[PDB]
Write an enzyme that holds these catalytic residues in place. Structure first.
Site, PDB file in Angstrom:
ATOM      1  N   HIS A   1       0.775  -1.262   0.000  1.00  0.00           N
ATOM      2  CA  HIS A   1       0.000   0.000   0.000  1.00  0.00           C
ATOM      3  C   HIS A   1       0.809   1.317   0.000  1.00  0.00           C
ATOM      4  O   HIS A   1       0.259   2.372  -0.272  1.00  0.00           O
ATOM      5  CB  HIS A   1      -0.971   0.054   1.222  1.00  0.00           C
ATOM      6  CG  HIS A   1      -1.598  -1.269   1.564  1.00  0.00           C
ATOM      7  ND1 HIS A   1      -1.214  -2.015   2.661  1.00  0.00           N
ATOM      8  CD2 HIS A   1      -2.555  -1.996   0.931  1.00  0.00           C
ATOM      9  CE1 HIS A   1      -1.891  -3.154   2.673  1.00  0.00           C
ATOM     10  NE2 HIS A   1      -2.710  -3.163   1.636  1.00  0.00           N
TER      11      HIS A   1
ATOM     12  N   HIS B   1       1.631   8.861   0.320  1.00  0.00           N
ATOM     13  CA  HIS B   1       0.544   8.671  -0.645  1.00  0.00           C
ATOM     14  C   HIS B   1       0.886   9.579  -1.852  1.00  0.00           C
ATOM     15  O   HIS B   1       1.441  10.686  -1.705  1.00  0.00           O
ATOM     16  CB  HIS B   1      -0.826   9.103  -0.058  1.00  0.00           C
ATOM     17  CG  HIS B   1      -1.140   8.412   1.217  1.00  0.00           C
ATOM     18  ND1 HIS B   1      -1.767   7.185   1.248  1.00  0.00           N
ATOM     19  CD2 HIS B   1      -0.806   8.693   2.491  1.00  0.00           C
ATOM     20  CE1 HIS B   1      -1.872   6.775   2.495  1.00  0.00           C
ATOM     21  NE2 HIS B   1      -1.255   7.645   3.267  1.00  0.00           N
TER      22      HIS B   1
HETATM   23  C1  LIG Z   1      -0.814  -4.077  13.745  1.00  0.00           C
HETATM   24  C2  LIG Z   1      -1.375  -2.903  13.009  1.00  0.00           C
HETATM   25  C3  LIG Z   1      -2.594  -2.273  13.323  1.00  0.00           C
HETATM   26  C4  LIG Z   1      -3.012  -1.168  12.540  1.00  0.00           C
HETATM   27  C5  LIG Z   1      -4.298  -0.476  12.844  1.00  0.00           C
HETATM   28  N1  LIG Z   1      -2.236  -0.735  11.494  1.00  0.00           N
HETATM   29  C6  LIG Z   1      -1.042  -1.382  11.224  1.00  0.00           C
HETATM   30  S1  LIG Z   1       0.079  -0.979   9.886  1.00  0.00           S
HETATM   31  C7  LIG Z   1      -0.900   0.378   9.173  1.00  0.00           C
HETATM   32  C8  LIG Z   1      -0.454   1.676   9.796  1.00  0.00           C
HETATM   33  O1  LIG Z   1       0.373   1.713  10.740  1.00  0.00           O
HETATM   34  C9  LIG Z   1      -1.015   2.969   9.285  1.00  0.00           C
HETATM   35  C10 LIG Z   1      -1.246   3.220   7.901  1.00  0.00           C
HETATM   36  C11 LIG Z   1      -1.779   4.436   7.488  1.00  0.00           C
HETATM   37  C12 LIG Z   1      -2.085   5.419   8.463  1.00  0.00           C
HETATM   38  S2  LIG Z   1      -2.695   7.020   7.930  1.00  0.00           S
HETATM   39  N2  LIG Z   1      -2.711   7.016   6.094  1.00  0.00           N
HETATM   40  O2  LIG Z   1      -1.579   7.978   8.302  1.00  0.00           O
HETATM   41  O3  LIG Z   1      -4.167   7.414   8.598  1.00  0.00           O
HETATM   42  C13 LIG Z   1      -1.846   5.181   9.823  1.00  0.00           C
HETATM   43 CL1  LIG Z   1      -2.255   6.358  11.029  1.00  0.00          CL
HETATM   44  C14 LIG Z   1      -1.323   3.925  10.228  1.00  0.00           C
HETATM   45  N3  LIG Z   1      -0.632  -2.432  11.980  1.00  0.00           N
HETATM   46 ZN   LIG Z   2      -1.123   7.724   5.406  1.00  0.00          ZN
END
Ligand SMILES: Cc1cc(C)nc(SCC(=O)c2ccc(S(N)(=O)=O)c(Cl)c2)n1
Ligand SMILES: [Zn+2]
Length: 259
Positions: free
Chosen positions: A62, A94
């Site tokens: 991603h 992104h």
């Molecule tokens: C074990 C576990 C739980 C969760 C909720 N995410 C992950 S990896 C995804 C991750 O950390 C993440 C990806 C994208 C975002 S965003 N685009 O900034 O809102 C955030 Cl805050 C976390 N791993």
């Molecule tokens: Zn993000």
């Protein structure tokens, strides 16, 4: 699950397996500066990022993620709209299929070329990122806009690695990363309460989005689109676009630290 950004599994499809997609504090949003309220009680950002906290860069399918060692307190965000210490966890980006769009947050109807997210979690209250992700005050994400401009010496560390992590699942050691220096020189910011912009879409994020963009060259940004959302030995798909559309504000206040 197998969400993504392609036609069958992309943002419009997310509601199917993640009903919070239609929630009241979804991210990202349009920032309409004519509707932003300066708030004199917002504090400056207080930032420490130890370049040795950076451990690993990997292709999640991603985005790329730079993982930081978040067992220690070396890299912490405080101030801004935040109560308490928010530990640094991860950085990702992104972008869109071409340079004229790709940011998640949009400003005054305009998309930047890309948007850097710096993910932190409340270590005063929660034992780990995984628990903090479920609480309204659990996460804080710092967003930095990237606009096309001159080649960025600070992004080049990342771009130099991207061929070694071309397929989803691939990772490579990544350390001495001076994340601070990647920030724009002004730390003025907008802030609102919101969500992860990717599944599970949890409404646990205090958004802190910096007004001032940083530069990236066209050729630098194009390297991110050379990443695959698919693994080695699988049918290939390029990660050409990985941004979610703006979501309904639903009466939330976007505040500004500056005027
Ligand atoms: C074990 C576990 C739980 C969760 C909720 N995410 C992950 S990896 C995804 C991750 O950390 C993440 C990806 C994208 C975002 S965003 N685009 O900034 O809102 C955030 Cl805050 C976390 N791993
Ligand atoms: Zn993000």
């Amino acid at each position: 699950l197998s969400w993504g950004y392609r036609e069958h599994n992309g943002p419009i499809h997310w509601k199917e397996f993640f009903p919070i997609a239609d929630g009241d504090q979804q991210s990202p949003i349009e920032i309409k500066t004519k509707e932003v309220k300066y708030d004199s009680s917002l504090r400056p950002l207080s930032i420490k990022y130890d370049p040795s906290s950076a451990k690993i860069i990997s292709n999640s399918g991603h985005s790329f993620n730079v993982d930081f060692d978040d067992t220690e307190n070396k890299s912490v965000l405080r101030g801004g709209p935040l109560t308490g210490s928010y530990r640094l966890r991860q950085v990702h980006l992104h972008w869109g299929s071409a340079d004229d769009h790709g940011s998640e947050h949009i400003v005054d109807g305009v998309s930047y070329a890309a948007e850097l997210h710096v993910v932190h979690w409340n270590s005063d209250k929660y034992p780990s990122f995984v628990e903090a992700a479920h609480e309204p005050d659990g996460l804080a994400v710092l967003g930095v806009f990237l606009q096309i401009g001159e080649p960025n010496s600070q992004l080049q560390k990342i771009t130099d690695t991207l061929d070694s992590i071309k397929e989803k699942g691939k990772q490579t050691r990544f350390t001495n990363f001076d994340l601070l220096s990647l920030l724009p020189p002004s730390w003025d910011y907008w802030t609102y309460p919101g969500s992860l912009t990717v599944p599970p879409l949890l409404e646990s994020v205090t958004w802190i989005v910096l007004k001032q963009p940083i530069n990236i060259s066209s050729q630098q940004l194009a390297k991110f689109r050379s990443l695959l959302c698919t693994a080695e030995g699988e049918a290939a798909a390029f990660l050409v676009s990985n941004h979610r559309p703006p979501q309904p504000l639903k009466g939330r206040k976007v505040r500004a630290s500056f005027h």
